[PDB]
Amino acid sequence: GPNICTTRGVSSCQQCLAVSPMCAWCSDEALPLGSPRCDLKENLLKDNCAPESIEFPVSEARVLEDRPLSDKQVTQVSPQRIALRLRPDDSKNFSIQVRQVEDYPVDIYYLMDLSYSMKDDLWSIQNLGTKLATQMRKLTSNLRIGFGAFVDKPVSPYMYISPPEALENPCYDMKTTCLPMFGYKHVLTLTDQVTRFNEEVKKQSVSRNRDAPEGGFDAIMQATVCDEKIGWRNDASHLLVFTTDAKTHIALDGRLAGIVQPNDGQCHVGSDNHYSASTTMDYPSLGLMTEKLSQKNINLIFAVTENVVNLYQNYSELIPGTTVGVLSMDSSNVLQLIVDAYGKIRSKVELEVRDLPEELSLSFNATCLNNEVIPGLKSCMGLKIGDTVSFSIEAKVRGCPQEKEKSFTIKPVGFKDSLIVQVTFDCDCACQAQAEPNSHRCNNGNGTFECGVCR
Template identity: 60%
Template sequence: MRSPGTRMWRVALCCVLMETFVHIARGLNICTSGSATSCEECLLIHPSCAWCAQEDFGKGWTVTSRCDFSQNLQKRGCEARFIEYPTSSMSILQNTPLSSKGSGSAQYDVTQIMPQRVSLSLRPGGQTWFGLQVRQVEDYPVDIYYLMDLSLSMKDDLDTIRNLGTKLAYEMGKLTSNFRLGFGSFVDKNMSPFSYTAPKYQENPCSGYKLFPNCVPTFGFRHILSLTDKVDRFNEEVQKQMVSRNRDAPEGGFDAILQAAVCKEEIGWRKEAYHLLVFATDDVPHLALDGRLGGLVQPHDGQCHLNDKNEYSASTTMDYPSLALLGEKLAENNIFLIFAVTKRLYVIYKNFTALIPGTTVEILDQDSKNVIQLIIAAYNNIRSKVELTVWDHPEDISLSFTATCQDGKPLPGLMKCADLKIGDTVSFNVSVEARSCPPRGTDQSFTIKPVGFKDRLEVTVDYQCDCGCSRKAQLNSRICSSIGTYNCGTCLCEPGYLGAHCECQEGEVSSMYLSACREAEGKQVCSGRGECSCNQCLCYESEFGKIYGSFCECDDFSCPRHKGILCSGHGECHCGECKCHAGYIGDNCDCSTETSSCISDDGQMCSGRGSCVCGRCQCIEPGAFGDTCEKCPTCPDACGTKRDCIECRLFKSGHLADNQTCQRLCKDEIITVETLKTDEPGAVLCLYKTDDDCVMKFTYLEHASGQSVLTALKEPECGGGPDAMMVLLAVVGSILLVGVALLAAWKLVITVHDRREFARFQSARSRARYEMASNPLYKQPVSTHFVETDFNMYGRSYNGGVH
């Protein structure tokens, strides 16, 4: 199985070969076009160029440049042993394996970064790669220094934390078996206009203040308890403290932070421990230059100034420290700063975190009741991410990072990984390129260090700027007519002499030499930018730059520009073509290959809605905009994405709250209202059902300024929950009612039918013609019929009948 380093070596080699082939395909030989006159000049042209130091090289060939691609030199008869072709390389000097546990092992053997020492051999323009791994080990010792604002407004907070030590030690004991706690306090500079300076306020600045008539004198910073594992001492010292009072709203907290960071021995920071500095306040801090209001013009020197009473002695002699100085000293001493501030200050201190690496912000309750949960949350947040920083970065070296986090997906341009678990291992690949050669004898090195870690990777750099053949240079060599130095196959002639072997003197011109000074028949001698002397061109000087080449055909100023800057300031001009520095491409080197600016807060490239072109996101998804295409109110998943932020910010629920990433991913302003207006132009209405079957409504609006605003109901809309007994009774009652209704209908139908039949019977009975005593069905056995007759008897007529 091939190692990552082997794969990266192959990638680097392929990159160089591909670039060489591109030049060949264009018909441009960047090596010969530079017309280098020495081996060292050849090496600086391009990392694919080689130099032939063979004495008789070039005989019988039209092209005699000793600087060319290595394969071309060999084809033209240069033996491999005479070819100078140094390449960039990397070697690992120390590679101690990563540790898996902290306090349970020998503490001074804990290793969280691998390798620890690397040596690079760099040829200008050439790239080399190396990989490093970082792991946050389990059960690592923790030092927490609690730095508290003791101005008058923090009195209720002081009462709350009087038993903080015991509770905090109990909670931290679940995370580490080696925990220490310390305490310090601050107010502000005891001078006008920051504090009350009248004599009556010197001993008691609260004099005349009815609510709290007794206070201690104002002080800048006071170190009270060094880091200790005896947490009862913390409780004892806190219970002794009293608040003080200053005049203006801002506090002198940055003075205190700097002293807590640089006074390592007094505070008791351990080398083998995580250093957490908890800064608790309810107001904004004074910044650098604020001290000039009190006449303090001396910038802070970044040193420890604690007197024998453990109080900050330079409070009234030096200005407040700058953010840059704070960040430098915190990083230098491996300290994670936790801003524990009230909700109204969250945005202000959040902006500070962008300028101070390794800093987090947590929202503190008005009376500090949630301080323990806050510290635990901040600790988990700190240990869930790894971010690299580079120290003492040489200006002529270009670095490019690619992070591989837990999902195994390479993220070019990224120097950090988030959402990690303790014990996870992340990897980074680092590409290194030297843009130029430093002065001879200059040692170069730099350090790669995870923020807040004591562990670091030391990188030493050796430059391949000299040729091996230069060590065999011959002064006044016979090859150079005894008037020049023979070096790497060429003669460096004494002033006034020219020619391949110093055989000519300056000023000698003849027609036989002129043809050798034309690039082609019909072209100008020396391209019109030089004069021919002893069969070679002497190029004119130009106020714009250098003119060079065998026929003065090249210069270092006729390259494409961007906004008036040659090669955009990100490359070197070589014979009309920009040779871009690492990390830039394009004809004028204006296109950055860096993608870190395109990575959104969720770790996706352009939020998954676009592509990164020249270091900027080009949004593809309709309706998407923003620096990383993160804003898209019409995208199908906009409501779903903002729902997670509503849940974690307003209700401390959802998967973002569990992963401690709410503050990182959810930066939109959230406004809570009693009644939600849905008719605002451009606002998108979003609804979702909560776990308790309530309906949460909010609107999502993107302003023209790019600011996103979420307007949400304070509480979800919930209907009254149904009574199970009432529902049961209603169902049973409904069934009974339907049954009774069906029976009544059936009874009605039967009754109507019977009545109709009875009426029909009565009608038939009334029409009957017989007596009730006789049987209408009985018939007599003898029937009688009356027959009428008409006859004449004795002259008379009779009518009669026969029965």
């Protein structure tokens, strides 16, 4: 029979609102003394309280900033700013949309075979390099690209060691010039400066050694395990593009240079940017390469000339996840592998809350790609670039806080974009503004007359 509004003290309008969100207060002075002032809105109208005199705050959610989601500044969350107005112990819901607009981060590190056999292939690896940079930059604005070069272990019999002039110029005996031999050179750290990367790639020239199989696997291992030097990012797709026109040296080959120490799988580049253990440590085995590529989360692509495609296809089957493309005057084959790799990238939208007041609590409903409402969930997975998800958030306040104006943020993990929610707490009635300081009606040490009542 009796309700909570009528049966709980209610000396004033303010106390009435604090009881429950369903309570209303009548300020009509024509209302008789028998009728309660704090009651359900239905019970007041039914008891002839004037519709204008009824106080019944309704919680609202107004959008303030509603810049639309971007297509192709960048807006990925919509809306951006909301004003929640809450009465005591009440709640209110609101919607948020989140779209993956920004391109996914991809690291490409390019390994150039600069041995003498590559003289006729030099243009092709420069073309490929600059096309990698230029075209993948069109595909993703979050590309970082860098490179290094290799020949082989600078030690006899791989290296020409006579006459003395052959050391600085391996091409001495052909009456021409080329660069000194070297194992692996890190040349350019992963950078977003595409123009610069292209300029350096175009400056590269060949060196020379004696035996056809080369030391690229030393380079692959060091490109994989030298984290800081190469510059791989923690939350980026990592692609290692390896180029050559020949066979490769493998673990246990190094004994022909008197080198028997097994590869340790550790970084040995450092200050001068050369592989320092090139002449003292054996080539890595396929199994060790596999382990480090997996441990560092790097995808190896062999970009090799047609004469050795079958060779590297066959090594590829022994290092799972590795792919083979054809190095030629045409960049398309290898580029397709990278574009295909980019097409397999998926992302998540996981909402996190910041600066949430003690008094407020939130509950979330997620609507992901399946177009079905998963209640209590605040994250979606499996998004591609351009996909959109939506959440419904309900904020509930505990009682009435004295602060009266607070703010919090709702933000997807790894996004710049966020929703700022400004919260206002509406605990007072409008009739309190017309408080009338003088008593007039009470006149027995009470004071003030608000909303049609004494103390």
